[PDB]
Structure formats: C-alpha cells, structure tokens
Design an enzyme around this catalytic site. Structure first.
Site, PDB file in Angstrom:
ATOM      1  N   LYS A 163      -1.639   1.467  15.395  1.00  0.00           N
ATOM      2  CA  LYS A 163      -1.772   2.292  14.223  1.00  0.00           C
ATOM      3  C   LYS A 163      -2.158   3.653  14.498  1.00  0.00           C
ATOM      4  O   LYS A 163      -3.414   3.469  15.341  1.00  0.00           O
ATOM      5  CB  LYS A 163      -2.273   1.403  13.167  1.00  0.00           C
TER       6      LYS A 163
ATOM      7  N   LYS B 143      -4.592   6.888  12.779  1.00  0.00           N
ATOM      8  CA  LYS B 143      -5.133   7.235  11.701  1.00  0.00           C
ATOM      9  C   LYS B 143      -5.234   8.748  11.724  1.00  0.00           C
ATOM     10  O   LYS B 143      -6.085   9.221  12.683  1.00  0.00           O
ATOM     11  CB  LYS B 143      -6.253   6.629  11.280  1.00  0.00           C
TER      12      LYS B 143
ATOM     13  N   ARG C  95       0.866  -1.243   0.001  1.00  0.00           N
ATOM     14  CA  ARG C  95       0.071   0.100  -0.089  1.00  0.00           C
ATOM     15  C   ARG C  95       0.757   1.302   0.053  1.00  0.00           C
ATOM     16  O   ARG C  95       1.785   1.216   0.810  1.00  0.00           O
ATOM     17  CB  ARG C  95      -0.896   0.082   1.097  1.00  0.00           C
TER      18      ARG C  95
ATOM     19  N   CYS D  17     -15.088  -3.969   2.483  1.00  0.00           N
ATOM     20  CA  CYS D  17     -13.734  -4.286   2.493  1.00  0.00           C
ATOM     21  C   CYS D  17     -13.127  -5.309   1.623  1.00  0.00           C
ATOM     22  O   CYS D  17     -14.156  -6.008   1.057  1.00  0.00           O
ATOM     23  CB  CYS D  17     -13.312  -4.560   4.017  1.00  0.00           C
TER      24      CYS D  17
ATOM     25  N   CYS E 216      -7.502 -11.243   2.003  1.00  0.00           N
ATOM     26  CA  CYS E 216      -7.429 -11.115   3.342  1.00  0.00           C
ATOM     27  C   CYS E 216      -7.197 -12.229   4.283  1.00  0.00           C
ATOM     28  O   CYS E 216      -8.034 -13.105   4.480  1.00  0.00           O
ATOM     29  CB  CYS E 216      -8.536 -10.295   4.060  1.00  0.00           C
TER      30      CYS E 216
ATOM     31  N   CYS F 192     -14.773  -8.980   8.767  1.00  0.00           N
ATOM     32  CA  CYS F 192     -14.587  -9.489  10.036  1.00  0.00           C
ATOM     33  C   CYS F 192     -14.797  -8.213  11.056  1.00  0.00           C
ATOM     34  O   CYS F 192     -14.685  -7.089  10.447  1.00  0.00           O
ATOM     35  CB  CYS F 192     -13.142 -10.123  10.144  1.00  0.00           C
TER      36      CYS F 192
ATOM     37  N   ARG G  77      -0.979   5.674   9.304  1.00  0.00           N
ATOM     38  CA  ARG G  77      -1.623   5.338   7.852  1.00  0.00           C
ATOM     39  C   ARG G  77      -1.952   6.399   7.130  1.00  0.00           C
ATOM     40  O   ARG G  77      -1.425   7.572   7.610  1.00  0.00           O
ATOM     41  CB  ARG G  77      -3.079   4.404   8.228  1.00  0.00           C
TER      42      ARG G  77
HETATM   43  C1  SRM Z   1      -7.949  -2.261   1.934  1.00  0.00           C
HETATM   44  C2  SRM Z   1      -8.804  -1.792   3.139  1.00  0.00           C
HETATM   45  C3  SRM Z   1     -10.263  -2.050   3.160  1.00  0.00           C
HETATM   46  C4  SRM Z   1     -10.820  -1.723   1.694  1.00  0.00           C
HETATM   47  O1  SRM Z   1     -11.420  -2.143   1.321  1.00  0.00           O
HETATM   48  O2  SRM Z   1     -10.706  -0.594   1.352  1.00  0.00           O
HETATM   49  C5  SRM Z   1      -7.804  -2.375   4.511  1.00  0.00           C
HETATM   50  C6  SRM Z   1      -7.408  -3.638   4.271  1.00  0.00           C
HETATM   51  C7  SRM Z   1      -7.047  -4.547   5.231  1.00  0.00           C
HETATM   52  N1  SRM Z   1      -6.894  -4.141   6.757  1.00  0.00           N
HETATM   53 FE1  SRM Z   1      -7.612  -2.465   7.407  1.00  0.00          FE
HETATM   54  N2  SRM Z   1      -8.123  -1.692   5.485  1.00  0.00           N
HETATM   55  C8  SRM Z   1      -8.775  -0.520   5.240  1.00  0.00           C
HETATM   56  C9  SRM Z   1      -9.214   0.265   6.204  1.00  0.00           C
HETATM   57  C10 SRM Z   1      -9.130   0.159   7.551  1.00  0.00           C
HETATM   58  C11 SRM Z   1     -10.251   0.628   8.465  1.00  0.00           C
HETATM   59  C12 SRM Z   1     -11.055   2.045   7.782  1.00  0.00           C
HETATM   60  C13 SRM Z   1     -10.309   3.381   7.678  1.00  0.00           C
HETATM   61  O3  SRM Z   1      -9.093   3.507   8.369  1.00  0.00           O
HETATM   62  O4  SRM Z   1     -10.937   4.578   7.155  1.00  0.00           O
HETATM   63  C14 SRM Z   1     -10.255   0.265   9.728  1.00  0.00           C
HETATM   64  C15 SRM Z   1     -11.020   0.504  10.572  1.00  0.00           C
HETATM   65  C16 SRM Z   1     -10.811   1.765  11.380  1.00  0.00           C
HETATM   66  C17 SRM Z   1      -9.996   1.575  12.822  1.00  0.00           C
HETATM   67  O5  SRM Z   1      -8.627   1.330  12.344  1.00  0.00           O
HETATM   68  O6  SRM Z   1     -10.392   1.591  13.855  1.00  0.00           O
HETATM   69  C18 SRM Z   1      -9.324  -0.833   9.651  1.00  0.00           C
HETATM   70  C19 SRM Z   1      -9.124  -1.483  10.561  1.00  0.00           C
HETATM   71  C20 SRM Z   1      -7.990  -2.640  10.444  1.00  0.00           C
HETATM   72  C21 SRM Z   1      -7.440  -3.320  11.434  1.00  0.00           C
HETATM   73  C22 SRM Z   1      -7.921  -3.530  12.957  1.00  0.00           C
HETATM   74  C23 SRM Z   1      -6.884  -2.125  13.542  1.00  0.00           C
HETATM   75  C24 SRM Z   1      -7.237  -2.247  15.180  1.00  0.00           C
HETATM   76  O7  SRM Z   1      -6.976  -1.004  15.451  1.00  0.00           O
HETATM   77  O8  SRM Z   1      -7.563  -3.278  15.707  1.00  0.00           O
HETATM   78  C25 SRM Z   1      -6.802  -4.399  11.078  1.00  0.00           C
HETATM   79  C26 SRM Z   1      -6.031  -5.643  11.750  1.00  0.00           C
HETATM   80  C27 SRM Z   1      -4.689  -5.197  12.515  1.00  0.00           C
HETATM   81  O9  SRM Z   1      -4.186  -4.193  12.187  1.00  0.00           O
HETATM   82  O10 SRM Z   1      -4.309  -5.991  13.515  1.00  0.00           O
HETATM   83  C28 SRM Z   1      -6.664  -4.264   9.513  1.00  0.00           C
HETATM   84  C29 SRM Z   1      -6.048  -4.927   8.759  1.00  0.00           C
HETATM   85  C30 SRM Z   1      -6.066  -5.084   7.600  1.00  0.00           C
HETATM   86  C31 SRM Z   1      -5.348  -5.891   6.480  1.00  0.00           C
HETATM   87  C32 SRM Z   1      -4.136  -5.008   5.731  1.00  0.00           C
HETATM   88  C33 SRM Z   1      -5.296  -7.338   6.752  1.00  0.00           C
HETATM   89  C34 SRM Z   1      -4.066  -7.775   7.590  1.00  0.00           C
HETATM   90  O11 SRM Z   1      -3.793  -7.340   8.841  1.00  0.00           O
HETATM   91  O12 SRM Z   1      -3.239  -8.671   7.137  1.00  0.00           O
HETATM   92  C35 SRM Z   1      -6.446  -6.029   5.516  1.00  0.00           C
HETATM   93  C36 SRM Z   1      -5.620  -6.292   3.823  1.00  0.00           C
HETATM   94  C37 SRM Z   1      -6.955  -6.989   3.110  1.00  0.00           C
HETATM   95  C38 SRM Z   1      -6.300  -7.201   1.702  1.00  0.00           C
HETATM   96  O13 SRM Z   1      -5.965  -8.264   1.315  1.00  0.00           O
HETATM   97  O14 SRM Z   1      -6.208  -6.279   0.889  1.00  0.00           O
HETATM   98  N3  SRM Z   1      -7.252  -3.074   9.317  1.00  0.00           N
HETATM   99  N4  SRM Z   1      -8.854  -0.802   8.191  1.00  0.00           N
HETATM  100  C39 SRM Z   1      -8.357  -0.403   3.954  1.00  0.00           C
HETATM  101  C40 SRM Z   1      -6.907  -0.095   3.606  1.00  0.00           C
HETATM  102  C41 SRM Z   1      -6.701   1.259   3.936  1.00  0.00           C
HETATM  103  C42 SRM Z   1      -5.416   1.974   3.786  1.00  0.00           C
HETATM  104  O15 SRM Z   1      -5.339   2.464   2.632  1.00  0.00           O
HETATM  105  O16 SRM Z   1      -4.625   1.938   4.897  1.00  0.00           O
HETATM  106  S1  SF4 Z   2      -9.097  -7.604   8.377  1.00  0.00           S
HETATM  107 FE1  SF4 Z   2     -11.403  -8.183   8.118  1.00  0.00          FE
HETATM  108  S2  SF4 Z   2     -12.659  -6.089   8.020  1.00  0.00           S
HETATM  109 FE2  SF4 Z   2     -10.170  -5.767   7.225  1.00  0.00          FE
HETATM  110  S3  SF4 Z   2     -10.131  -6.388   4.951  1.00  0.00           S
HETATM  111 FE3  SF4 Z   2      -9.879  -8.240   5.952  1.00  0.00          FE
HETATM  112  S4  SF4 Z   2     -11.774  -9.237   6.367  1.00  0.00           S
HETATM  113 FE4  SF4 Z   2     -12.199  -6.959   5.792  1.00  0.00          FE
END
Ligand code: SRM
Ligand code: SF4
Ligand SMILES: [K+]
Length: 456
Positions: A101, A103, A3, A320, A326, A365, A65
């Site tokens: 992280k 944001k 990313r 997502c 994922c 999830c 981020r």
């Molecule tokens: C691509 C995206 C969803 C989408 O369809 O757009 C995404 C994709 C993933 N996110 Fe995210 N998140 C995306 C926005 C967010 C959001 C929404 C936002 O930020 O606007 C959140 C919820 C808000 C928040 O953070 O509270 C979100 C909360 C997380 C979390 C849980 C974080 C936490 O604090 O617990 C994880 C898991 C982790 O980090 O342990 C995570 C983990 C992941 C990962 C990288 C999975 C991993 O840990 O290996 C997912 C990758 C999937 C893939 O195969 O591409 N992603 N993730 C967004 C990428 C944004 C970016 O460019 O950085």
């Molecule tokens: S971590 Fe969960 S909510 Fe984020 S892309 Fe994967 S399935 Fe979607």
C-alpha cells in the site's frame, strides 16, 4: 469494514447526514469511527456504495490509501490551495499494481498533524505571499514492524528536494512508478518504499524520479514543525469565519447516555453553513462557521458533550481500533486508552505537570496503525494486556522511539512512567518535551538510523 476515499478529510454536511443514517441503521455497532487518515469507517455492516455514490463519495487492486492534508493551518488562507492539491493528487493516483500500500500527504508547516513520517510520499507546502509556490518532497516513511523480526523497521521519510508547483503530478507519478518497478518482488514484508530506498539508496531512487518526471529537484526550502496536535476549540479563520475543533475520544462517534455525540453532530450538520474536516488525530472540525453562527453551533456542541474539557494529555493521545473488530489485534488499544489516560492524568497531576502533554499512543499490534512508532511514548501490543513500551520520540514526530521495556502489563507500564514523568517534571529544561528529555538524560538511546539502529 468499509472505509471511504475522502482526500484531506473534507466532508459536506449533506454527506455527513447520509453517513450518519447508514451508520445508525445498517451496521452492528451504529457508530461512525473517524480514522487517523482523515476519513471514516463503519463497523459491522449487516448498498454502502450506492449510499456513498448518491452523495458523491466513493470507497477505494488499489493499493492507495487516503491522501491527507493539514486540516487547520495557522495561515488559514493556505488551506484551500493545499486541499486542492491533495484532491488532485488523490485523483491522479486512482487506477500500476503497487507491491504494498502507498500513503501520501500534503503538509502545511509548522503543523505535522498528518504525521508525515508515517507515509511513503509527502508534499510539504512552501508558500510566498500567502500563495503556494511549490513543495519539498519527502519519501520513505512507514511504521509497520513485525515482533522480534530485525529485518523489519519503522523508518522516517527522506528529503528529496524542492519542486515548483507545476511539477507536482509528474513527480507524484514518478515516485509511484519507481517504487512499483523497484519494490521487492518476492517478499511482501520487504515491499514497502521504506525498504526499497534502503536497498537502492536515496540518491539512486531520487535520480530515477528526476529522470522519469523530466525535472531536477532544487535544494530543500526551509520548513520547521512546531507540533502535531489539533487546535481544540475556536480559532479564527479568514473573513468572519471561525473553525471549531471538537475533541472526540478515539474518534468514536456514538450516542452515549447523557452524551449524545452522534445526534449532536447530526444537529450541527443540519444547521452548519460550511462543512466538516476529519483530522489526522481522529477529531472533527466544524469549519467555516460565520461569527454570527458561533453561539448556535456552540450551544449544540456543549449540550451534546462534544465540548467536555479534557486535559492537554488526553488531547494528544491516540490509539488504533484493535478489538473487538480488528482481526490482527494482539492487545486492546481503543478500548484501553480512556482508562489508561485516566491513570496518566493522575500521574501528571501528581508531578505538577497537569498542563503539559506527552504525545502518547497505543497500537494494538506491530502493524502500527495507532502510530505509536512516532510517539514520545508508544505502546505496542504484544499479547492480551501486554505491550512493548517505546520511549524517545519527540513532539513533532521526526524520531522513532526505541523499545524500552518489552511485553509488560499496564501496572508495570504505569510504574515506569510514574518514575520517568517524575524525573522529567524536576529535571527538564525550559520547554523541553518528555521524549527529548529521556534521550538527553540517557534513559534511552536515540534511534538515529532506523534501518540499522532501531533494534537492540
Ligand atoms: C482505522 C485505522 C486505525 C485508527 O484507529 O485510526 C486502521 C485500521 C486497520 N488497519 Fe491500518 N489503520 C489506520 C492507519 C494505519 C497507519 C497510520 C497512518 O497511515 O497514518 C498505519 C501505519 C503506517 C504504515 O502504513 O506504515 C497502518 C498500518 C496498517 C498495516 C501494516 C501495513 C504494512 O505496511 O505492513 C496493516 C496490515 C496490512 O495491511 O497487512 C493495517 C491493517 C489494518 C486493518 C484494516 C486490519 C486488517 O488488515 O484487516 C485495521 C482495521 C481495524 C478495524 O477493525 O477497523 N494497517 N494503518 C487507520 C485507518 C486509516 C485509513 O483511513 O486508511
Ligand atoms: S492491525 Fe494492529 S495496529 Fe492496526 S487496528 Fe488492528 S490491532 Fe491496531
Ligand atoms: K481524538
């Protein structure tokens, strides 16, 4: 999984061509996936950093981020300055090891397209005479939860106060450092700023930020949001410039039979005067198109299937990535959304509300990437084909939806919504949204203080 750091989602046509090539030639999927944080992702990389670096791009120990910035403000002139600040904050935060992280966003009312309540730190722009004068600071948003773990919760951001433009970086740094120091040392699941604030209290955290920044917050200056959706189609910008926002389902850019979305964007990139803007709704804006160039750009977009009309419902829905890439995915999201909305569109027509919309989101999830925890109707993946159904958020995204039904299947979800949309269509007041309706009509209790009343 790579990313890119791309503050405010602004990417040049030169940079686009570089990423288009890489996506097509060096990844398993061959797609460009626009994310809801205004950047892009490649899937199945089979050198990326040299390709990025060669066009002036860099991929983010760094717990930061992408910094978001309202993409298409109604007052078009305000974008340049707000964008300037998003970029400055982004660079200022670049490497303090954060507990979790972090944001950040820069918001231009009345649009909350960036979904500020999902973020740790938010700077809401206050302008006078078309010039930015300062920011209202809101801190503590976060959506991630763990199934059945009442110690976790989604939380909205808290207002700290107003600060003159000159204090921006000092305040940004103070928030980050206070969180770095105060964040829960033991448990990572309680490390996020949302948890820190609830533990020490907003005023306590606020006082420390003022102390560190060397300033005192002024009272919040008035601001209101009217929506979170993109402005699909053509909108007039400054001078003779126009902005064309293209709806891209799931932000998945790939060439499909009879819908060469990827090639189409490449063709536009080759003749486009300005640049592109990736939105927080996973869409793309062809920005700064001179009036004289409108027809050319539109012809390509139209021929490529980039301008195929969808319902307002589909335009305001999001999911997502989830499967197949994922590793944390519990239920389908991106791959489920299209047919799911086909069903919702049918229900909307059935009830005579085809012109209306419900901010509907599906997250694979409980990590919550799809931002279902800020939707009017949110689906949270629990297992293959099963989701928790949440109701009661609002159009502007300032309220967390409470869980309505748990671990149910699509047919069960559709049946519940058929019933609810029907009542909404017939019992709603003038201009009343679905989420607000479910709360007023007593269908679901509102979440008033997430840390304490999110869970039943
Ligand atoms: C691509 C995206 C969803 C989408 O369809 O757009 C995404 C994709 C993933 N996110 Fe995210 N998140 C995306 C926005 C967010 C959001 C929404 C936002 O930020 O606007 C959140 C919820 C808000 C928040 O953070 O509270 C979100 C909360 C997380 C979390 C849980 C974080 C936490 O604090 O617990 C994880 C898991 C982790 O980090 O342990 C995570 C983990 C992941 C990962 C990288 C999975 C991993 O840990 O290996 C997912 C990758 C999937 C893939 O195969 O591409 N992603 N993730 C967004 C990428 C944004 C970016 O460019 O950085
Ligand atoms: S971590 Fe969960 S909510 Fe984020 S892309 Fe994967 S399935 Fe979607
Ligand atoms: K989209």
């Amino acid at each position: 999984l790579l990313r890119c750091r791309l503050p405010g989602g602004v990417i040049t046509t030169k940079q686009w061509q570089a990423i288009d090539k890489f996506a097509g030639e060096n990844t398993i999927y061959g797609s460009i996936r626009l994310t809801n944080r205004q950047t892009f992702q490649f899937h199945g990389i089979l050198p990326v950093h040299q390709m990025l670096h060669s066009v002036g791009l860099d991929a983010l120990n760094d717990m930061n981020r992408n910094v978001l910035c309202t993409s298409n403000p109604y007052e078009s002139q305000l974008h340049a300055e707000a964008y300037e600040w998003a970029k400055k904050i982004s660079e200022h935060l670049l490497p303090t090891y954060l507990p979790r992280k972090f944001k950040t966003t820069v918001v231009i009312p009345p649009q909350n397209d960036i979904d500020l309540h999902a973020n740790d730190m938010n700077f809401v722009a206050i302008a006078e005479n078309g010039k930015l004068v300062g920011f209202n600071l809101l801190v503590g948003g976060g959506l991630s939860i763990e199934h059945g773990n009442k110690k976790t919760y989604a939380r909205t951001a808290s207002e700290f106060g107003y600060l003159p433009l000159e204090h921006t970086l000092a305040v940004a740094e103070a928030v980050v450092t206070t969180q770095r120091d105060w964040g829960n040392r033991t448990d990572r699941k309680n490390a996020k700023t949302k948890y820190t604030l609830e533990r020490v209290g907003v005023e306590t955290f606020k006082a420390e930020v003022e102390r560190r920044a060397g300033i005192k917050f002024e009272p919040i200056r008035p601001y209101e949001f009217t929506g979170r959706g993109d402005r699909i189609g053509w909108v007039k910008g400054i001078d003779d410039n126009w902005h064309l926002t293209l709806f891209i389902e799931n932000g998945r850019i790939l060439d499909y039979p009879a819908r060469p979305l990827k090639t189409g964007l490449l063709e536009i990139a080759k003749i486009h005067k300005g640049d592109f803007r990736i939105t927080a709704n996973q869409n793309l804006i062809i920005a700064g198109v001179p009036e004289s160039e409108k027809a050319k750009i539109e012809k390509i977009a139209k021929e490529s299937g980039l301008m195929n009309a969808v319902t307002p419902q589909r335009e305001n829905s999001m999911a997502c990535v989830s499967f197949p890439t994922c590793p944390l995915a519990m239920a389908e999201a991106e791959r489920f959304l299209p047919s799911f909305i086909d069903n919702i569109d049918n229900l909307m027509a059935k009830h005579g509300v085809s012109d209306e919309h419900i901010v509907m989101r599906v997250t694979g999830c409980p990590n919550g990437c799809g931002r279902a925890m800020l939707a009017e109707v949110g689906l949270v993946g629990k297992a293959p084909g099963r989701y928790n159904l949440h109701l009661g958020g609002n159009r502007i995204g300032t309220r967390i939806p409470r869980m309505y039904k748990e671990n149910i299947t699509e047919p069960e979800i559709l049946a519940s919504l058929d019933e609810l949309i029907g009542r909404w269509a017939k019992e709603r007041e003038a201009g009343e949204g679905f989420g607000d309706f479910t709360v007023r009509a007593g269908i679901i209790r509102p979440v008033l203080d997430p840390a304490r009343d999110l869970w039943d």
